[PDB]
RNA sequence: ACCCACUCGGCACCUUACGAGAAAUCAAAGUCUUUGGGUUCUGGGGGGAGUAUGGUCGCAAGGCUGAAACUUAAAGGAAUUGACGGAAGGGCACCACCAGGAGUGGAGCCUGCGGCUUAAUUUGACCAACACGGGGAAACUCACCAGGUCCAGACACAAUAAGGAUUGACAGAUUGAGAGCUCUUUCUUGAUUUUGUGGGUGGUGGUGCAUGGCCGUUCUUAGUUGGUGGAGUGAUUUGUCUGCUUAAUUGCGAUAACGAACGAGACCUUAACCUACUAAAUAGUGGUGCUAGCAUUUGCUGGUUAUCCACUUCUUAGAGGGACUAUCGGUUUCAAGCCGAUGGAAGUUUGAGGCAAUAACAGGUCUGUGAUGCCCUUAGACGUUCUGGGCCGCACGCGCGCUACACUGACGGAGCCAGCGAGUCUAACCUUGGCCGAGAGGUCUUGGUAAUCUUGUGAAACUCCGUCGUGCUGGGGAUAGAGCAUUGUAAUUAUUGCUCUUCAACGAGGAAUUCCUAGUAAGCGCAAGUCAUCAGCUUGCGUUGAUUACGUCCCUGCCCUUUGUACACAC
């Protein structure tokens with residue numbers, strides 16, 4: 001998917017050794033929550049906001065300043 | 066891929082070598098009894114040949130040496 | 141004769157093993173290194189071999205008893221995972237089939253491969269090789285063949301070294317050659333080199349079965365993994381599952397598992413909708429406001445933001461909205477879902493892609509790489525250049541294709557419509573327009589570094605009106621001859637284009653075999669890539685636009701579960 005382009009960073013190196021070439025592939029997935037550019041979270045990483053639960057009152061109790 | 070030995074139909078040729086002669090002062094200048102000397106070789110007309118251009122000689126022509134021009138001794 | 145409660149003896153069953161066992165399993169196969177109730181028989185790795193011989197019984201067939209030589213590193217038991225099965229159950233695929241369409245296989249030609257031939261006809265590859273190596277090679281490319289140069293042999297050491305160590309050379313032999321390559325007599329330069337010894341550098345030399353990277357394939361599927369816990373001595377297993385559902389290990393759920401991860405989905409690009417927003421001589425429309433050209437109680441057009449006003453429906457691109465199977469009706473372990481209809485631009489994941497897990501293959505590439513180990517070679521080179529030739533060579537076999545077999549047509553006139561692109565000033569790219577030429581093309585200019593110009597790429601199929609008239613015919617245009625041009629130093633083995641002439645097979649193609657379910661098949665052309673020149677190739681683009689089926693497991697295969705296995709190099 002796209003988040004591979006967004007958050008995955010890969011490097012490939014050849015290592016010359018006395019017996020041959022040894023391939024190194026480094027792949028790093030950085031935390032989406034950091035950085036200020038592009039998407040800041042993975043797709044479908046849905047978060048919900050707490051309802052800030054409030055009790056209900058009984059009487060109308062008109063209020064005037 | 067197997068490769069064969071190259072077999073030559075012609076003899077080997079040698080690379081040319083500079084001729085070894087111990088004549089570097091003998092045939093260049095001559096000294097008179099008193100000491101007067103005048104260069105016996107000719108001068109290239111083209112100025113980019115040098116005062117010491119030292120035109121060489123052959124049987125039927127004179128070789129420049131640097132500008133590679135051809136003249137005649139019987140001019 | 142039934143019922144209930146017992147009891148002794150018997151054939152047996154169910155649960156679990158506290159116990160035993162290598163395990164399968166076992167109420168005995170328990171009471172076994174905590175080893176002893178009594179007693180009979182048998183075995184000592186696999187074969188040779190229940191063979192030979194002797195004895196004994198039998199009418200015989202044969203039975204009972206029963207070796208050795210020699211040979212050999214396993215044979216064997218139970219269980220695990222996978223793979224396989226002409227095993228079962230459940231799903232799935234147009235690289236499978238059904239119903240079909242278009243074909244290919246038959247012809248001529250183009251191209252690749254094999255084989256032959258050749259100095260060479262370089263070479264890799266054999267579903268997952270064969271218009272593939274972006275591989276459409278005149279030179280180059282090039283790796284091959286016949287020859288000619290050159291060192292672009294760095295550095296260290298030693299030797300030669302006052303004209304030397306060294307080059308370079310006009311002409312004349314010579315060489316295909318104006319290569320001083322080798323020479324013919326002799327001049328230039330000057331510690332830059334030569335020679336030898338180590339060493340080094342190149343190599344489209346070998347090894348892809350020593351490697352990296354990349355790519356293809358397994359595998360277009362849904363699959364894969366650890367943590368803690370449970371089961372097992374263990375390899376392993378559960379989690380990761382009966383059922384229903386989904387394209388989906390997608391979910392509903394069930395549950396010795398719980399809670400997670402990758403893959404799927406989500407995501408991204410593109411294609412459709414927006415009279416909503418923001419606006420635009422690099423896009424358009426209107427007002428013709430401005431002159432206006434042509435016909436006429438008003439139409440078609442010209443120049444239209446430095447002649448001018450507006451305004452974004454169409455065009456463009458930013459921010460956005462829009463679909464979430466919405467609603468409704470049915471059906472369902474009535475849950476996940478599924479099927480119809482109505483709305484809507486859009487209801488097969490709305491279409492198409494991009495990205496894409498674990499494990500792997502001795503899959504391909506050392507000929508992409510100044511990625512590379514090792515081996516070989518390195519001055520008469522397997523290094524590098526230059527000339528010429530080959531890669532294209534034809535008794536033949538095969539795979540991609542192109543053009544056809546005609547009247548649903550060919551030819552002629554006229555009509556007349558796209559979309560994706562690309563394009564030069566570090567040099568000649570896309571080319572309008574005028575003139576010349578039958579043509580191909582030539583010439584003089586212009587515009588365009590580009591929503592500006594080429595270009596509305598006025599493409600082709602197609603359409604309409606005519607010639608033909610079922611005759612291999614005016615279908616077909618292979619082969620071949622003559623001439624005219626363009627690209628290129630160079631066109632012969634004919635680069636390609638054009639004109640005239642020649643006018644072959646082919647009358648729909650055996651066995652066999654490919655692709656495909658809607659803007660899809662098929663027809664048709666166009667742009668880009670490769671490109672000095674060369675498309676019958678590819679990558680995309682649009683124009684015209686069907687038939688058939690919404691299925692099955694018969695063939696070919698794929699996935700899961702169960703089962704068998706003497707398979708694990710895995711049928």
Ligand SMILES: [Mg+2]
Pocket residue numbers: 001
């Ligand atoms: Mg995805």
Ligand SMILES: [Mg+2]
Pocket residue numbers: 150151
């Ligand atoms: Mg009984």
Ligand SMILES: [Mg+2]
Pocket residue numbers: none
């Ligand atoms: Mg034995």
Ligand SMILES: [Mg+2]
Pocket residue numbers: 244649
């Ligand atoms: Mg055919």
Ligand SMILES: [Mg+2]
Pocket residue numbers: none
């Ligand atoms: Mg060549």
Ligand SMILES: [Mg+2]
Pocket residue numbers: 348503
């Ligand atoms: Mg390999």
Ligand SMILES: [Mg+2]
Pocket residue numbers: none
């Ligand atoms: Mg465990």
Ligand SMILES: [Mg+2]
Pocket residue numbers: none
């Ligand atoms: Mg050559």
Ligand SMILES: [Mg+2]
Pocket residue numbers: none
């Ligand atoms: Mg070829």
Ligand SMILES: [Mg+2]
Pocket residue numbers: none
């Ligand atoms: Mg257009």
Ligand SMILES: [Mg+2]
Pocket residue numbers: 674
């Ligand atoms: Mg060519």
Ligand SMILES: [Mg+2]
Pocket residue numbers: none
């Ligand atoms: Mg082209």
Ligand SMILES: [Mg+2]
Pocket residue numbers: 271677
């Ligand atoms: Mg090609």
